[PDB]
Amino acid sequence: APGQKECDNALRQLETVRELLENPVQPINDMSYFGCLDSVMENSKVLGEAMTGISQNAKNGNLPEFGDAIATASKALCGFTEAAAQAAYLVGVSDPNSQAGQQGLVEPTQFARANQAIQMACQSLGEPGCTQAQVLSAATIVAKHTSALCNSCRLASARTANPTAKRQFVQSAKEVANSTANLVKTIKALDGDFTEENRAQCRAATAPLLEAVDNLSAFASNPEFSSVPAQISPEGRAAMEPIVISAKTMLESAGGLIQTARALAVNPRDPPRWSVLAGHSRTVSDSIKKLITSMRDKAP
């Protein structure tokens, strides 16, 4: 039983990271091509060490060290996939017939979620049968998302060369940050105070924040700030393909490695599974070698 949850979590993490290879036609991080090559090289070293840790600790029944090696492999495999997916995008967009497009100022999905979370927290802290503890827990949700919104505003301000947009992203973030401080002040103010006037008073302090959040959502929704997707030409997709296939093969074999290790950890008396394990481990290594060679040969 012990060790199996680590393996199950790793297999779930692999299933998630594999979506990055389905249509890698947009950037997924800020890594340069050499950033990608550096990350692939470092993770190759880490994974090599982890694959040896997985086999040796399953063999010897060191189940805490086995679990750490499974977790370490998983993290290195996810890093590899992120680097491979970014590298593929950069290869595709570098083709002469590709159109690179532009980065949007604010990632829209997490932006909308942050605004909704603040709005829902403000509504929750205002519900009539809500306990004082729920007021405080709602405040922590507001603080979390207020910090994320401010960071994203500072980034958006950095990304734009338009002085008016530069200034407005900061001012809008400032309005959100100061309204949260006033709301937190009023929550902190509540001490042994659980009366209808303070319930109404907390509700009252949500208004400037909800308005500031709405004003920022309206400002940030200007189509001028939106991403314009890259267009990858057929030849760019052909150029990316060896990187994508090698990364997909690494993950397929890594998944088999982890499934095999999960069984061997419980029962290491299994000569067939030991060969399968060595086969998956060598195919993982072969795929990484092919991916690095492909990243160098197909380099823009």
Binding site: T140, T146, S147, A148, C150, C153
Partner: peptide, 19 residues
């Protein structure tokens, strides 16, 4: 602590207030 907690949550908020 009630102040330490909200400080941990508010992240790098000061970079905006000072700005």
């Amino acid at each position: 602590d009630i102040d330490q907690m909200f400080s941990t949550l508010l992240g790098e908020l000061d970079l905006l207030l000072q700005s």
